[PDB]
Amino acid sequence: HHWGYGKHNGPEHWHKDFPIAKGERQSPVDIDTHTAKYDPSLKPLSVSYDQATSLRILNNGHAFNVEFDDSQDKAVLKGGPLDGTYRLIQFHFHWGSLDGQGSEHTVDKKKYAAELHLVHWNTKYGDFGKAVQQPDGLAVLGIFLKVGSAKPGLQKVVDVLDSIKTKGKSADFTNFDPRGLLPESLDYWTYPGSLTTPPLLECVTWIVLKEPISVSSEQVLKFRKLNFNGEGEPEELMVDNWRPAQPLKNRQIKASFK
Ligand SMILES: CSc1nc(Cl)c(C=O)c(NCc2ccc(S(N)(=O)=O)cc2)n1
Numbered sequence: 001h002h003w004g005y006g007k008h009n010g011p012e013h014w015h016k017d018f019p020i021a022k023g024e025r026q027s028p029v030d031i032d033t034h035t036a037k038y039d040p041s042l043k044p045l046s047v048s049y050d051q052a053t054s055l056r057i058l059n060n061g062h063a064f065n066v067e068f069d070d071s072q073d074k075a076v077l078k079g080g081p082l083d084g085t086y087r088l089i090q091f092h093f094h095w096g097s098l099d100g101q102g103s104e105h106t107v108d109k110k111k112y113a114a115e116l117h118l119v120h121w122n123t124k125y126g127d128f129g130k131a132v133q134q135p136d137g138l139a140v141l142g143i144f145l146k147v148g149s150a151k152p153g154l155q156k157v158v159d160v161l162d163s164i165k166t167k168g169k170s171a172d173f174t175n176f177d178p179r180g181l182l183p184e185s186l187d188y189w190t191y192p193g194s195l196t197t198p199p200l201l202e203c204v205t206w207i208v209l210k211e212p213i214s215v216s217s218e219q220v221l222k223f224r225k226l227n228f229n230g231e232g233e234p235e236e237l238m239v240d241n242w243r244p245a246q247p248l249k250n251r252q253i254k255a256s257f258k
């Protein structure tokens with residue numbers, strides 16, 4: 001009886017195995033755009049993905065992860081609210097059963113169809129496992145998806161999904177360029193938070209881009225053909241793998257713009 005997003009093991013249940021679920025800096029959160037304060041001390045974000053090396057794509061039973069070689073300084077996130085350098089390790093998405101839901105963060109209570117998470121760890125801690133034990137261990141870059149025109153840069157991901165339908169399946173996924181998933185503007189909101197899945201560790205500087213990317217109905221429909229279950233098990237469509245907004249508590253969301 002492991003955690004999930006099903007009828008009986010979903011977000012409302014996680015606190016039983018992971019008490020930090022009711023903690024002081026949990027994610028995601030609603031971004032109230034009128035209350036987020038412009039912070040002129042914030043820097044432009046620096047996203048350096050030219051040398052990114054993707055290796056593999058994995059269905060882990062909760063989402064799919066596109067995994068990167070992080071054995072040297074290649075693909076890094078710095079600047080913005082960050083001190084030091086954060087290395088890209090994987091990206092994944094959260095999405096809905098319908099276009100009207102799927103994102104984890106919301107914007108003035110608006111839910112997007114999906115949300116992309118580019119996950120980076122602070123190189124000062126040497127590896128990911130050590131980084132997640134620190135309040136400034138991770139930086140996750142969050143990007144909203146809306147349904148409209150196709151994202152050509154996403155299609156290579158969409159097309160490989162049929163080969164990793166069920167939990168535990170993986171496929172070679174080399175030479176994928178995540179620059180193709182970025183919007184035009186890097187304007188962002190930022191706040192201190194947590195992993196949005198168990199173990200829900202309070203180790204993330206969240207950086208959420210204001211500009212969503214557009215993907216097509218057909219592209220997101222293919223996300224929805226994935227399975228939570230393993231091969232040869234009754235089919236459970238991989239949909240609604242998002243955690244709802246959590247109490248903001250004693251935190252301020254800062255804006256990089258205007
Ligand atoms: C705790 S040990 C560990 N080690 C590795 Cl090697 C990974 C690999 O990713 C990992 N991932 C957990 C994770 C959960 C949730 C999020 S989210 N939905 O907040 O962006 C990012 C990362 N956790």
Ligand SMILES: [Zn+2]
Nearest residue numbers: 092094117196
């Ligand atoms: Zn995520």
